Write a protein that binds this DNA or RNA. Structure first.
Ligand SMILES: [Mg+2]
Ligand SMILES: [Mg+2]
Ligand SMILES: [Mg+2]
Length: 223
DNA sequence: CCTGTGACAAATTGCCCTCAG
DNA sequence: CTGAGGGCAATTTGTCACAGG
């Protein structure tokens, strides 16, 4: 049963926001949204090194490294919602540790309604589905794909490439499409195919000499 | 203009070790 | 013993010159 892992349920506004974060910063982001979901919430969240190591198959010393550098790298990271245009900071206070092996973070109290969206306008996935991805961009794509998933784990969706560049905030050399192909599309599609239960194919949409959309579709291995 | 590949750079990976308390 | 530190080589991500349709 896929039901063994936490159920991540985020608003589609988050699924579609424009931001940069590392794999490690996102692994934590999942744990934070879970914890608001279980409370009039105020923004204080807690992380235990020992538990984070259970969850991601890591050693105690390595989990401490990953948390400690992620938490430092939130400084100056804005998140932008869209159309619409609203920019917020993730943390309003620096994180700190009062007990050995435990950190206390203060997430911005305005983001919470953006996490807990309006009814039937939301994305959802088990934590197991995404814990073995490595590339953060491959994590963004798996999120967006999940947004279109029917009850039976199948779906089809067309994303415009300029929109992928803006929301996933991809590096500049990928505006030149042979590089986008080689260092993002093939790498992220292979990863979903090897690390998740999803089975993914795609076709490109040219207009004139240009490529403008990727047309993704997928079934679940439970077929 | 469009494409793919080779090369170099800079970054991320899981892993090894000391050491404090 | 846990976990806060330092460090590593190997691999993957990011940049871009060159050659062909
Ligand atoms: Mg990153
Ligand atoms: Mg609390
Ligand atoms: Mg690491």
């Amino acid at each position: 049963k896929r039901k063994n892992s936490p159920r991540i349920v985020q608003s589609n506004d988050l699924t579609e926001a424009a931001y940069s974060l590392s794999r490690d910063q996102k692994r934590m982001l999942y744990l934070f949204v879970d914890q608001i979901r279980k409370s009039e919430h105020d923004g204080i969240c807690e992380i235990h090194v020992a538990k984070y190591a259970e969850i991601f198959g890591l050693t105690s010393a390595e989990a401490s490294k990953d948390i400690r550098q992620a938490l430092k790298s939130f400084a100056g990271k804005e998140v932008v919602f869209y159309k619409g245009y609203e920019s917020f900071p993730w943390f309003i206070k620096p994180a700190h540790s009062p007990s050995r092996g435990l950190y206390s973070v203060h997430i911005n109290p305005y983001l919470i309604p953006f996490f807990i969206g309006l009814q039937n306008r939301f994305t959802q996935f088990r934590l197991s589905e995404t814990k073995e991805i490595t590339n953060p961009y491959a994590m963004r794509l798996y999120e967006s794909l999940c947004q279109y998933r029917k009850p039976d784990g199948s779906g089809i969706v067309s994303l415009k490439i300029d929109w992928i560049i803006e929301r996933y905030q991809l590096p500049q050399s990928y505006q030149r499409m042979p590089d986008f192909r080689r260092r993002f599309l093939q790498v992220c599609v292979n990863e979903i195919n090897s690390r998740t239960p999803m089975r993914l194919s795609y076709i490109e949409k040219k207009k004139g000499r240009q490529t403008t959309h990727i047309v993704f579709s997928f079934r679940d291995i439970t077929s």
